[PDB]
Amino acid sequence: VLKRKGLLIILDGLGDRPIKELNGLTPLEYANTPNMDKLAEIGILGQQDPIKPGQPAGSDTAHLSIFGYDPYETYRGRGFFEALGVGLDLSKDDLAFRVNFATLENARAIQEEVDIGVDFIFKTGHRAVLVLKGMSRGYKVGDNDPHEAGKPPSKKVAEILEEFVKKAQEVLEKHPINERRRKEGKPIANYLLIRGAGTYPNIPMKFTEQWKVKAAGVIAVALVKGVARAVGFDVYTPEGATGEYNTNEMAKAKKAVELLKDYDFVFLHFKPTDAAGHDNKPKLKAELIERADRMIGYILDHVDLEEVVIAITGDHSTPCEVMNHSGDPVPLLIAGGGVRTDDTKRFGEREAMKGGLGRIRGHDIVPIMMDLMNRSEKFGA
Amino acid sequence: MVLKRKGLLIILDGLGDRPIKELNGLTPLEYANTPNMDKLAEIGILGQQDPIKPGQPAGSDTAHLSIFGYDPYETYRGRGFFEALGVGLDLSKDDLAFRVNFATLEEEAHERAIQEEVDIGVDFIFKGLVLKGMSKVGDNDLIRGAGTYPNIPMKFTEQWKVKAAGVIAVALVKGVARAVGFDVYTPEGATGEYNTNEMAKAKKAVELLKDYDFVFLHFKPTDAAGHDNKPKLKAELIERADRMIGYILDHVDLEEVVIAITGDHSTPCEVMNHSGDPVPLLIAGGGVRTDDTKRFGEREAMKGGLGRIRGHDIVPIMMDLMNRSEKFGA
Ligand SMILES: [Ca+2]
Ligand SMILES: [Ca+2]
Ligand SMILES: [Zn+2]
Ligand SMILES: [Zn+2]
Ligand SMILES: [Zn+2]
Ligand SMILES: [Zn+2]
């Protein structure tokens, strides 16, 4: 018997709620998406709860779920994923944090200003060794060495962190950029807001070994590249992919198709749809879902569905009326060899409510894909 | 007493089609992004209509005689007359009108000259009958369609005791409409070609509803794309119609205006000509018993609450929704 490849596509924050300006439709329904409708037509639809009914999931916990893990048991914080995201190589005993440059006195800093402000801090010195690297805008990443055990900020690390903020401030309050900054009347980046303490996730085994496959992912956003790396994926970020409105989606598709030739399972992430939701811009979000449809249309023109099982959904809902992640289930579609196609015709939340897959959990998606790919092993007998 | 309403009938020439492979098995209308018509389908009611009868292809003129509530076979007396009426001429019972085409002879090698060049050529032909440049026509007291005075019972306006106006560009449809009692207009930009100005048609249409009780709006281009077998283009044209229709919805109160949308016949790309396939029809507004359809398309029309009707049942249904129908008996 022949096994098949897998293609899991995530349209970040896809799910939404009825929008009045869209005649009561959601951005996904309103948006012209002939390719996803074609796939929903020959495929099967369903609704998935990343975590559980009515429970909003952060981007990191939602993706652990999408990759096939139980977020409530594997999740050990965000920091570590962010650190792996910026390309660092950490040990399972390290503790990482997401850092925001702030202003303390008794700024929307530039991406290059944080890289410099970060450099000087690396070159700050306390009891334990640490890595401090900037990521994007006023953000940054802090890594405390073999301190995973104190991941719930414990007493020891908060004193280190507290010495680190005091010490960091000294370094910070002195950089020329800040120096130019107070002169230019701009709020200085002299304080450090540290949060999202995280260690390596408590997962039994990696994705690759669990399912015995080679797995690659086309991803731009740091946090998602981190989760993917933590579970064992070979992450790629093609030229042009920024995870923002100006991203090259056709470049992501081009790469996804390439990777299918050397990997068994490929994961593709598209982030911009989620930003439009956070900013309450229904039309824009719908416009972005349309760019994704064309991206998908490209992939479909270069792959055989009898050889590739395709799944498309969102890691979670991000309603424009909520301007943040919601607990609303997310539309899901699966098409390809092995699928028992239901009678749904288009891809949308109301249609998914009638799909043959029913209402499942986000961590059900990979197992069902793996089974359609004939890569599942029985339990018992 | 009881409030009467106005009616607005929109005809997208050749709207109907057949499933197209490159369009994933969908028709151009189903494939096209039409939020405004889908919205109207959702709040309205759908059905399919046979211009003349099941499996019977109808020309643009006979189909419109049907759509205006008449009987094709009893009223139709040739294409020429309507063509002549569409150019502003005033013909008499004993005249014989014709459709003329400026073509190249060498054997007829080519049957695209500029409008101004045709009138200039029309002027000199007439200088040394009535030959007139349209976008030509020959009236006798690449020519064809010998038509004579049309035999219609009575005018649309008298029949329904209403003031009717139409926003048309194509000569042929302007003729049929004038012939039935319509005050026909044609704003600047409206050309009946792919380059026409759908917005001018919609703008004029809204304005016309202020002084008229029934307004008819015709859109030609969709049909042209069907003839040349251009699926993607037909869809784009249909999308332009949806925008046009959107403007109108942003300026009229559906509770006072009964709106109907359909084609006068099917012009399937794979046929490059008129077919006898029933055309999708939608009706929305005051008095309508909304069914459970959610989009405007041939397949959804198959599930509409109006069922499969004739082209000549449309006006009667609109008029009854406008409370302008009259009981027979009692
Ligand atoms: Ca199906
Ligand atoms: Ca309805
Ligand atoms: Zn997300
Ligand atoms: Zn988000
Ligand atoms: Zn026609
Ligand atoms: Zn035609």
Best of A19, A20, A32, A35 to disrupt the B interface (most B CBs within 10 Å) is A32
Closest CA to B294 of A39, A33, A23, A37: A23
* Nearest-Cα residue of chain A relative to residue B24: A38
Residue B61 sits at φ, ψ, to 5 deg, of -75, -50
Cα(A192)–Cα(A99) distance, integer angstroms:
7
Cα(B316)–Cα(B102) distance, integer angstroms:
40
Of B24, B31, B35, the CB nearest to A30: B35
- Say if the Cβ atoms of A41 and B24 lie within 8 Å: yes
Cα(A276)–Cα(A288) distance, integer angstroms:
8
Cα(A218)–Cα(A252) distance, integer angstroms:
6
Check: CB of residue A46 under 8 Å from CB of residue A322: no
**Does B250 reach chain A within 8 Å, measured CB to CB?**
no
Name the experimental technique.
X-ray
A269-301 residues labelled b (16+ CB within 10 A) or e (exposed): bbbbbbbbbeeebbebbbbbbbbbbebbbbbbe
Resolution (A): 2.4
Check: CB of residue A271 under 8 Å from CB of residue A12: yes
Ranges of CATH 3.40.720.10 domains, chain A: 1-80+201-381
Q: Strand, helix or coil at A182?
A: helix
Check: CB of residue A140 under 8 Å from CB of residue A86: no
Q: Which CATH class is domain B1-77+151-330?
A: alpha beta
Distance from CA of B159 to the nearest CA of A (A): 37
Distance from CA of B263 to the nearest CA of A (A): 23
Q: Strand, helix or coil at A275?
A: helix
Q: Residue B112, Cβ neighbours under 10 Å: how many?
A: 5
Residue B284 sits at φ, ψ, to 5 deg, of -140, 155
> A1-80+201-381 falls under which CATH superfamily?
Alkaline Phosphatase, subunit A (3.40.720.10)
Topology of domain B78-150, CATH: Alpha-Beta Plaits (3.30.70)
Closest CA to B101 of B128, B85, B124, B80: B80
Check: CB of residue B225 under 8 Å from CB of residue B21: no
Judged on CB neighbours under 10 Å (0-12, 13-18, 19+), B328 is exposed
Q: Strand, helix or coil at B253?
A: coil
**Does A246 reach chain B within 8 Å, measured CB to CB?**
no
Which amino acid is present at B148?
T
Alpha helices in chain B (DSSP H): 28-31, 35-43, 60-67, 72-75, 79-86, 115-127, 156-160, 171-179, 198-211, 221-227, 231-249, 298-301, 314-321
- CA A16 to chain centroid: 17
Distance from CA of B171 to the nearest CA of A (A): 35
For chain B, the helix, strand and coil percentages under 3-state DSSP, each to the nearest 5: 35, 20, 45
| C-alpha dist (Å) from residue A27 to A21, A227, A347, A349, B173 | 10, 27, 11, 10, 39
Cβ neighbours of residue B112 closer than 8 Å, sequence gap 6 or more: none
β-strands A95-102, A139-144: how paired?
A: antiparallel
Residue A173 sits at φ, ψ, to 5 deg, of -60, 5
Q: Strand, helix or coil at A163?
A: helix
Ranges of CATH 3.30.70.2130 domains, chain B: 78-150
